[PDB]
Description:
It is classed as hydrolase. The structure is a homodimer of 306-residue chains. By secondary structure, chain A is of the alpha+beta class. In chain A, 21% of the residues lie in helices and 23% in strands. Among the domains of chain A are: 11-91, Thrombin, subunit H; 201-297, main proteinase (3clpro) structure, domain 3 (Orthogonal Bundle), CATH 1.10.1840. Chain A has helices spanning 11-14, 54-58, 201-214, 227-236, 244-249, 251-257, 261-272, 293-297, and strands at residues 17-22, 26-32, 35-39, 66-69, 73-75, 81-83, 86-90, 102-103, 111-118, 121-129, 148-151, 158-166, 172-175. A seven-stranded antiparallel beta sheet of chain A has the order 5-4-1-2-3-7-6, with no helix packed on it. In chain A, strands 8, 9, 10, 11, 12 and 13 form a six-stranded mixed beta sheet that branches. In chain A, helix 4 (227-236) runs parallel beside helix 7 (261-272). At the A-B interface, strand 9 and strand 10 of A face strand 9 and strand 10 of B. The complex binds zinc ion (2 copies).
Amino acid sequence: SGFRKMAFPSGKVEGCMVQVTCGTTTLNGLWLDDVVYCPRHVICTSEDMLNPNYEDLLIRKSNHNFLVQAGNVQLRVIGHSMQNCVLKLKVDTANPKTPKYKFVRIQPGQTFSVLACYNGSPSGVYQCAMRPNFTIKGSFLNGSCGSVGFNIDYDCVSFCYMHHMELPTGVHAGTDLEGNFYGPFVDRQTAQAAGTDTTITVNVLAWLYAAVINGDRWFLNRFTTTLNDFNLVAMKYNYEPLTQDHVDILGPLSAQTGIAVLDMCASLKELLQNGMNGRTILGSALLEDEFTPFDVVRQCSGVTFQ
Amino acid sequence: SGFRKMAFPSGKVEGCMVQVTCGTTTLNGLWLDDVVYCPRHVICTSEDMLNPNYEDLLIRKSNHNFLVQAGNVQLRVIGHSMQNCVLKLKVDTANPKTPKYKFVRIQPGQTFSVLACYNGSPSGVYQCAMRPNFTIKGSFLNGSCGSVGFNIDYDCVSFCYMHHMELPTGVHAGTDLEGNFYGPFVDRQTAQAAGTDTTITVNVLAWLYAAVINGDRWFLNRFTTTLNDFNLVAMKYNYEPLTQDHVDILGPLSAQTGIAVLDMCASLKELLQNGMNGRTILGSALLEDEFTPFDVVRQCSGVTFQ
Ligand SMILES: [Zn+2]
Ligand SMILES: [Zn+2]
């Protein structure tokens, strides 16, 4: 028992991080097969960040102007195209450490692990949520650009995020591994606004089920509710709408705990409507939305061998 | 900017985990050099847990009754002694993956990363605190015995914890790598009580300094206080005593932020004495004590290369 915000083990990823220097400007890259991937703004410096003309910048400092090191200066750079906001470095040799991997684009509310890196070496790892408004509330200092997010479980890494920028509020923004930003952001540094950030309701409910399995049961209803009256209330507190798709992904948990989804939904309301009381649930005085239903189950039925 | 409960990258540790089976009973072990380390209770089964006679148990199921696998059945077991609560398996070959490592015993209030493992393969990683009363509030299911905790930064692993038991309340208890329990616990399953758990005051204060560096400044005093009047109050809320040693480890942070320790101390009081208001600080509606002063600094001045 107990319950912690757990990250995936980072081993299969630490061996894929390199550094990329192009001029000054040196950041982290991702070395899979014979390709390094990294933020394309590694080709910029100063007032370039204000309005970069990426195509004009990239046609001048050539292939030998890019240094990629894996644990020492010695990868040969013999190619380059720009895929969206990502650079792509055709290089000399495969990584003798490249794990089984894949590139995925994930949806708001899903979680993943970030391996925070600075100039090519791992700093730490934490688990977080892609927010409804396509930002992440990360922990990034200067030099961590190119750090990646991923999911495991299986034999592999599913890569889903590359870090690109800090917005003027402390929030973080980045791309998939095809260089398409999540959300309406661009790799420039003028003025960029994200969402109202809403609470990921299906994740709160999944977390309430984890609390019941842990024996933190004081908040339980008995009441019930309609999915309409629920969603009517969820909203005026900036909780995203629960739908039938959400109800279905939660059924495994309903089955374990003997608590129907609509009943838990009825329980969430009173926490929202009436009080929380600064009673605690699973360590926290608020409500928690960075655990998916799969994350919570990831403990009964899947984390190692038969 | 931003601030997350970060764990150390787990790569150097994933390659040191094996499984150990001895009869039935199969758990995780730690393969360094030519030695596997694991909880000695891997030699028990049923009502053995009630009062194990470890010396009597161990003199019968011999060296070939122990199977140790690293990513496949094939390590040869040719030796064994019992060091305290830890088994110690003289085996055939060195691990071709053994990192630079060391064994350390740490003090209450210090933090480390746990690599939760089930039958020899990594499940996830999280960062936590050794509580004043020598327990940890972990996340462990059956089969995770032998999972280890560690600190990195450097070139290595500092190993500080091996998981042994869940107490009847959900709290967790274990040993150093010399098999000496942290706290007054024994690897038996009768009745065992731990502390009143107190709050790690020097860690709360370090976390308040992280909040100021992040720009979460609403709670700041200006007032001041005496170390006596502070400690008088800290206590009746079950906060451990701040001492001059604590004040000294915090000086680097005081210097960065321009806020003297006694002034932050004066600020902590009002949070304790008057209200919190369910205003938030750095994500949390409470106060947070699983970040050390070193953890908080670990971001300005040390996490990669020059
Ligand atoms: Zn950058
Ligand atoms: Zn056990």
